[PDB]
Write a protein that binds this ligand. Sequence first.
Ligand SMILES: COc1ccc(-c2ccc(S(=O)(=O)c3ccccc3CC(=O)O)cc2)cc1
Ligand SMILES: [Ca+2]
Ligand SMILES: [Ca+2]
Ligand SMILES: [Ca+2]
Ligand SMILES: [Zn+2]
Ligand SMILES: [Zn+2]
Length: 158
Amino acid sequence: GPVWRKHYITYRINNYTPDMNREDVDYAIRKAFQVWSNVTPLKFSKINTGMADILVVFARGAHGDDHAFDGKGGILAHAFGPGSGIGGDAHFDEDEFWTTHSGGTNLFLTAVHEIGHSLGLGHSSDPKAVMFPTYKYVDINTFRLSADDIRGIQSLYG
Ligand SMILES: COc1ccc(-c2ccc(S(=O)(=O)c3ccccc3CC(=O)O)cc2)cc1
Ligand SMILES: [Ca+2]
Ligand SMILES: [Ca+2]
Ligand SMILES: [Ca+2]
Ligand SMILES: [Zn+2]
Ligand SMILES: [Zn+2]
């Protein structure tokens, strides 16, 4: 599938969930990108204006991309594979309650998974992979990609 054909990738936080402190949104997203820069040649930079490669959006219900969100539960987030325009973008359902911890839905863990899609990864059948289709909290301070995730991302980059 499509992959970014450049090493410097930009993101922008379009808007911020009221569920969290701003600095904690910034940090969770930054750390999630770092999970992937750690195992690829990719470098990620947050920009504050202009067109980023990866636009990060919190939105609810129908939000302009034909993939409406569904209220609390169910779909938590989705992201588009590499490409121009909407490609790469990562959208988080505002009807979830995003957090820095095990309460609500953990934004960092969700973003690691979504960014994997923004980089071109699909889903893994391994429950230990971050790219497994199902959300489950794991301690975020000791989080590590599975061997399956590493094999997937290194099949695309590096
Ligand atoms: C700890 O690793 C994680 C594993 C999975 C996810 C995760 C993120 C999103 C979703 S989801 O929005 O409910 C979803 C459910 C079914 C199909 C597609 C999605 C979106 C998606 O997988 O990106 C489901 C799971 C998030 C983190
Ligand atoms: Ca939802
Ligand atoms: Ca984009
Ligand atoms: Ca919310
Ligand atoms: Zn969307
Ligand atoms: Zn997914």
